[PDB]
Design a protein around this ligand. Structure first.
Ligand SMILES: C[C@H]1O[C@H](O[C@H]2[C@H](O)[C@@H](O)[C@@H](O)O[C@@H]2CO)[C@H](O)[C@@H](O)[C@@H]1N[C@H]1C=C(CO)[C@@H](O[C@H]2O[C@H](CO)[C@@H](O)[C@H](O)[C@H]2O)[C@H](O)[C@H]1O
Ligand SMILES: [Ca+2]
Ligand SMILES: [Cl-]
Length: 496
């Protein structure tokens, strides 16, 4: 469960949040494959409640009605077409598996669902699965509301309803089997693994019992014996009885400490500074590198959901965000996931975004296609962070330096820092209020290198800054504190 199953030499996943299947398939062929992305996290592909108040929120996709593969992203044919096309160019698909719960207990009965399946939350009837009242935890939960009220009590966190979402009886072989049937459908189509949603709300042993029922990966694309990559969503910032480590038997675990701390450091909040990043990883209090799934922001916290946090960096803070993503992709800790977002009309009241529910760009609820502008950015209100030169080129940096040790660390005791990855890459950051102008040991072979933050190597020249490494490995760097992107990165494949 720990191996990503990516093609060799690909080290990151991108979350194409709410993208349609056909647009992901095109994106695999035209962009993700040639730019060396390892794979795509897709939104939940199973049928969900169509929620019309408010109007088609992104969160309706976390309210299952059945395991039919029919959503705003596309139908089963489109999903299959995408997985095949992406695998055929060596880009994997990872599914957001919503398996702790069905929909909200107060949702009205009927056929307001993305495939028109009937369901009746009040009677616990989901005939398209099928599930009935026997398959939920009504009798097991002991809280007055039936909902989760107190995270200090592990029992209710597992047995009661997360925000009123109907909680599946995961101790029952019947329920485990229906969930495994869904996941094996996806495996056989060609999916490479899963993000297990709401993992804190399931016992580690119930997750194990489901995973035990799963097939090996599709043997046309994956070697014999391959198991799905598993990464579990557990928000563990400390202080609770449930710990991220409780889930290590099953796969990797999201490290939510990572982006919270990195945001604080890059914002220079709470007396934090980049010089402290020399101890990044376990030295910062995080879980073991071989179990962490890391990221700067995710689809919940970029809009204040989940654990939220004022320090989280997102595309809305573009300059600091690119620097944070660059640092994450250059540093060896963890397995990296890059967010790819859409725009929505943020509007704050009482310190909170009252439009944090808004779903993807749409025409009367039908998701808009992703259009590509001449300059390779996206239209139709898709942000496409993964197409920004500074991020795209850092995804390649991570591939180029894969396996090389963290070395040649420099800091000025404040916010000017630099480090290398063996003899294959070097990166330099200026987050202080004055110019960073210094000759540094890079660990690289002598030559002229293109800075991949400002530009690209193409037909024997650079389109941005050039860095000149001498025979002794030293090179001069000059980065103004008012630079639009105040960091520089060079690597073995950007050498002229
Ligand atoms: C949104 C997250 O809520 C819970 O996180 C707790 C956390 O465990 C606790 O330590 C502390 O930090 O408070 C937070 C917030 O209460 C869950 O533990 C997380 O799993 C959860 N993230 C998840 C889960 C779901 C549910 O499938 C998704 O839901 C959202 O959709 C629901 C249902 O439609 C909406 O009602 C929510 O408002 C949405 O946030 C999340 O997107 C997914 O990532
Ligand atoms: Ca549960
Ligand atoms: Cl996540």
């Amino acid at each position: 469960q720990y191996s990503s199953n990516t093609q060799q030499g690909r080290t990151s996943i991108v979350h194409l949040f709410e993208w349609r299947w056909v647009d992901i398939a095109l994106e695999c062929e035209r962009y993700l494959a040639p730019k060396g992305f390892g794979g795509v996290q897709v939104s939940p592909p199973n049928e969900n409640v169509a929620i019309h108040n408010p109007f088609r929120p992104w969160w309706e996709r976390y309210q299952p009605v059945s395991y039919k593969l029919c959503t705003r992203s596309g139908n089963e044919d489109e999903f299959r077409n995408m997985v095949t096309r992406c695998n055929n160019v060596g880009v994997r698909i990872y599914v957001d598996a919503v398996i702790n719960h069905m929909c909200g207990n107060a949702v009205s009965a009927g056929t307001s669902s993305t495939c028109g399946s009937y369901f009746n939350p009040g009677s616990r009837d989901f005939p398209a699965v099928p599930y009935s009242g026997a398959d939920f935890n009504d009798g097991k939960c002991k809280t007055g509301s039936g909902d989760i009220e107190n995270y200090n009590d592990a029992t209710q966190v597992r047995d009661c309803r997360l925000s009123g979402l109907l909680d599946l009886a995961l101790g029952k072989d019947y329920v485990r089997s229906k969930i495994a049937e869904y996941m094996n459908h996806l495996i056989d189509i060609g999916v490479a693994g899963f993000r297990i949603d709401a993992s804190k709300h399931m016992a580690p042993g119930d997750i194990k019992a489901i995973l035990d029922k799963l097939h090996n990966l599709n043997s046309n694309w994956f070697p014999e014996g391959s198991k799905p990559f598993i990464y579990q969503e557990v928000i563990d910032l400390g202080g609770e009885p449930i710990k991220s480590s409780d889930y290590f038997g099953n796969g990797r675990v999201t490290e939510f400490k990572y982006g919270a701390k990195l945001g604080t450091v890059i914002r220079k909040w709470n007396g934090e500074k980049m010089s402290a990043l020399k101890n990044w990883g376990e030295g910062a209090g995080f879980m073991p590198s071989d179990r962490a799934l890391v990221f700067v922001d995710n689809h919940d916290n970029q809009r204040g959901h989940g654990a939220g946090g004022a320090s989280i960096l997102t595309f809305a803070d573009a300059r600091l965000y690119k620097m944070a993503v660059g640092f994450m992709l250059a540093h060896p800790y963890g397995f990296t996931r890059v967010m790819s977002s859409y725009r929505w009309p943020r509007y704050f009241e009482n310190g909170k975004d009252v439009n944090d529910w808004v779903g993807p760009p749409n025409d009367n609820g039908v998701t808009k296609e992703v259009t590509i502008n001449p300059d390779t950015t996206c239209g139709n209100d898709w942000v496409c962070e993964h197409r920004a030169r500074q991020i795209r080129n850092m995804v390649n940096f991570r591939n180029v330096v894969d396996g090389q040790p963290f070395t040649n660390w420099y800091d000025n005791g404040s916010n000017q820092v630099a480090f290398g990855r063996g003899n294959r890459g070097f990166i330099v950051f200026n987050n202080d209020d004055w110019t960073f102008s210094l000759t540094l040991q890079t660990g690289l072979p002598a030559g002229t290198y293109c800075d991949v933050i400002s530009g690209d190597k193409i037909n024997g020249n650079c389109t941005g800054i050039k860095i000149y490494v001498s025979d002794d490995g030293k090179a001069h760097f000059s980065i103004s504190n008012s630079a639009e992107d105040p960091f520089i990165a060079i690597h073995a494949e950007s050498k002229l």
